[PDB]
Design a protein around this ligand. Structure first.
Ligand SMILES: Nc1ncnc2c1ncn2[C@@H]1O[C@H](COP(=O)(O)OP(=O)(O)O)[C@@H](O)[C@H]1O
Ligand SMILES: Nc1ncnc2c1ncn2[C@@H]1O[C@H](COP(=O)(O)OP(=O)(O)O)[C@@H](O)[C@H]1O
Ligand SMILES: Nc1ncnc2c1ncn2[C@@H]1O[C@H](COP(=O)(O)OP(=O)(O)O)[C@@H](O)[C@H]1O
Ligand SMILES: [Mg+2]
Ligand SMILES: [Mg+2]
Ligand SMILES: [Mg+2]
Lengths: 371, 371, 371
């Protein structure tokens, strides 16, 4: 039958059936519990809400994110998220569908051990498999050679591949993601007097970040222009009728990706990370990786990130190379699209982990089979 | 000439001269205007009163604070308060003495912009400077490495410093301080039949709070003791001659610091704020910050506050670490003492913002010369 | 006059006087600068910190190493380090003492050219000499025959010397050293949850490696045993009282020496490289090199490394030969010890490059005199 492809992101959940062109159900990965006191009978029920029905009620809920930087911290909540996706979104009983999850590179082993343990023990899936996200992103584009940048809500990592032969000694992982951008935005917005303090208001700040932010091609010059003129201002309207206006915050926020010292981090931005990853491979294949620089992840949707990366990576490499950022319009869902492509290959059906093997080897087999 | 220090707090204006060890003047920051029609000739002058001459007469006045959570909400009254200070209380022509002011972190820029503009244009002080309250509080103790929990009247913030290099990425600020506790105290006194509603009677409940309230080392145990005994109850007499009595209110009111969910807020109490601030820092410097939990501000005078914070953080942090709380006896004027020390340093005389610089750059200078 | 000796290694500086027993000062070579912004007047000085003091304050600094793979990559900082070693650790006037140095084999000539230039012109030392490290190592053992293995922090090299005649073609230089092992340990410590990314955390991962890691005597059996139980597990406490546990990460890191493919390289482990070095020398002298096998360098201090090397070499060479690994307990400082021995020999005082000869011939004379 058709196997599920559930891409549990750090902030979003994508689910669907192998082969399709787009995820069937997409909903945020949060769980909210009421905090005030219910003074009425038979109303205000359901001690816990998940996804959209926790977004719409968020005003009176305290919203938790089960995953934290690509690591599942609250397993009791993650079981709930998976239950939601399997039953209330997809409307399937997973006991007849194989599954194909995803993980970030360099993620702690116990994370995926417990992942597969739950999948086999609670949901009784006949077989399943766990694939790194960079490999799926590289499938989606339909090629074999390139270096993936996959920047999501929890983790930003890079993975270079040459003709199907991975180079695990060049994979670099940098935990500066969309969540940290939103949490820095909440802090900088006070400079104007708009105090967002609650977990609910954090979703409002995420919405402002998605709607209005954009990466400056040249940070210093846009600083000067924005300070010297009001042509860069823009206004947002809160759910309660208020109106908030923001000026240079719009590009001050995404710039954290390229200058992690804005939030105290010591690393070098994503551009330097990619350059270092490419300069760690063999000398012959650096030329090809310079030319097939793939992008992915929702966080790479900031208008102008492709051009800023092009600039900041052409400034580094030798002047005789062709540095070519690939930025598909659907790069938000490239991981899932790659997963769906993968699961439908006939020659991949011998890479599943069958329930029979799990019943005979324990969860540790996930390492002896998967990547 | 000698530099003045004017720590125009939210509850009490502390104004004095650099080089001294105590403020030359303390008075409430309230401006009241009468409300009952006058009927006598030879009277009825001076429609507005400030400070103590408004506190005494409040029987016939409506009192209003100009600062609201460390943000000035009505400048027309703040000019009046500064004028009162300089001319009637300190009695110095301000245009012959530099002045040093204090501002809480994450405070909107416009606040300090107008703060500088008023001083330079109206009072024409030859020079001035604005400093964050936590750094002055650190100066007051003679240290150079600690984490300062300043709980003023409006705002409670937390600024970890290590060897003089502050760590802005890990600062906190919780809008929960004196006035909120006074409001909660008024709200829970109603349970006994004491209905205070007016702006005058809030200045009776504030005194009740300052006299009878304390902090419980174990809130549940105190609740049980109150339920099963009358030992905790205490007696207080109103201005007109009535006597009131309050029981568990005494330790309920300050408990709102550690469980903000009492007054509805999502945020976490002061102990969790401090632990989060310490953790965010570099792993090698948490050791020293654990042992320098300085305290300041008026609201940090409740009995049992230092001991309670000691217990809480010692319960949160790793068991091996030595947690210490530093609560100097005069910690109510810690910020003013810090400013007094700072204004005297010879190395500091170069950091004044001069009137010429203000003319050269205007209000935007305060974002370069001052922290 | 007395001659100084300074083994400018990659990871640590071993300085001191000729003729002594042990180095006078052994301080890490790192020039750090503060990354945060100071706020407190009255302290926060000394824009850069070098060596020990840099290690002490590394909580708020970025630590860069001036030497990388035994080639001075940053002269601005190496000059500061030399100035420190002379004027604050040895506390001597360098202009009065002949100064010996060291350099790895097959090291670019511009390196030592500028080394001699700086020593003769900036410090105005009277005479100097750049002796290859392995030869000094072999002096320190008293021998005059054998095959030196010296695994510094940056570079690993073999130098077969027979009867005082160094055979230059059989030399081998392998850029696998301590820092590579540190980085690989940092990489494989993510398998349990940890994240050491800052340059400050490199100086803690190196210490975990120095304290716990050990070489296996048979890697496959070690892995099989480790998988069986938790007997091998050991626990180490970070600077802030948090405890971490590691199992097979203790001996997967040192195994990089004997299977360089772990960190992505192609070349064969140190044992195959030594066997290949011997098997390029004349047949008449392979017996003498087999039975004399000197060790050196800090990285050769893993418990059991000598035994593993002996096993692996005997596994290749003909059965008749008697292999012997010489591992003096003081081998970490062998290079400096040999330098001090050499600087004292009466026959040596003619090898000096005098200031007059430097003036006559320029920097290039160090190629014609120094081996
Ligand atoms: N159009 C957009 N522009 C900018 N940021 C966006 C946009 N859409 C989503 N984001 C941000 O990217 C993150 C979600 O992207 P996503 O790829 O799904 O993360 P994850 O790996 O967990 O699945 C969120 O932090 C969100 O704020
Ligand atoms: N001994 C005390 N106990 C409890 N609350 C106090 C005490 N002294 C002052 N307060 C309260 O703290 C506030 C004033 O203290 P203060 O430190 O000066 O605040 P601010 O930051 O505005 O300067 C007032 O609300 C006052 O009621
Ligand atoms: N007992 C030990 N075990 C393992 N590694 C060690 C030990 N002592 C030092 N090292 C490593 O050796 C390196 C420094 O040794 P060293 O020989 O002096 O290098 P260099 O020649 O540049 O001076 C460091 O990276 C350190 O991690
Ligand atoms: Mg993702
Ligand atoms: Mg205050
Ligand atoms: Mg060496």
């Amino acid at each position: 039958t058709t196997a599920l492809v559930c891409d549990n992101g750090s902030g979003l959940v994508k689910a669907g059936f192998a082969g399709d062109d787009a995820p069937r159900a997409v909903f945020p990965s949060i769980v909210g519990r009421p905090r005030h006191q219910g003074v009425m009978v038979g109303m205000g029920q359901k001690d816990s809400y998940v996804g959209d029905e926790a977004q719409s009620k968020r005003g009176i809920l305290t919203l938790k994110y089960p995953i934290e930087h690509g690591i599942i911290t609250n397993w009791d909540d993650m079981e709930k998220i998976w239950h939601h996706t399997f039953y209330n979104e997809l409307r399937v009983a997973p006991e007849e569908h194989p599954t194909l999850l995803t993980e970030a590179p360099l993620n702690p082993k116990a994370n995926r051990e417990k992942m597969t343990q739950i999948m086999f023990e609670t949901f009784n899936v006949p077989a399943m498999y766990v694939a790194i996200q960079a490999v799926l992103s590289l499938y989606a584009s339909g090629r074999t050679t390139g270096i993936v940048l996959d920047s999501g809500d929890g983790v930003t990592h890079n993975v270079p591949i040459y003709e199907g032969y991975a180079l695990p000694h060049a994979i670099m992982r940098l935990d500066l993601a969309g969540r940290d951008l939103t949490d820095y935005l909440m802090k900088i917005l006070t400079e104007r007097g708009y105090s967002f303090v609650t977990t609910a208001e954090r979703e409002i700040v995420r919405d402002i970040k998605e709607k209005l932010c954009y990466v400056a091609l040249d940070f210093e010059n846009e600083m000067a222009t924005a300070a010297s003129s009001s042509s860069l201002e823009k206004s947002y309207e809160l759910p309660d009728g208020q109106v908030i206006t923001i000026g240079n915050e719009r590009f001050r926020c995404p710039e954290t990706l390229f200058q992690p010292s804005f939030i105290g981090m010591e690393s070098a931005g994503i551009h330097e990370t990619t350059y270092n990853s490419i300069m760690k491979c063999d000398i012959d294949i650096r030329k090809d990786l310079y030319a097939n620089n793939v992008m992915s992840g929702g966080t790479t949707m900031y208008p102008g990130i492709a051009d800023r990366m092009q600039k900041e990576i052409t400034a580094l490499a030798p002047s005789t190379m062709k540095i070519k950022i690939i930025a598909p319009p659907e790069r938000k869902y490239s991981v899932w699209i790659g997963g769906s492509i993968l699961a439908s290959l006939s020659t991949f059906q011998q890479m599943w982990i069958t329930k029979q093997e799990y019943d005979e080897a324990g969860p540790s087999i996930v390492h002896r089979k998967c990547f």
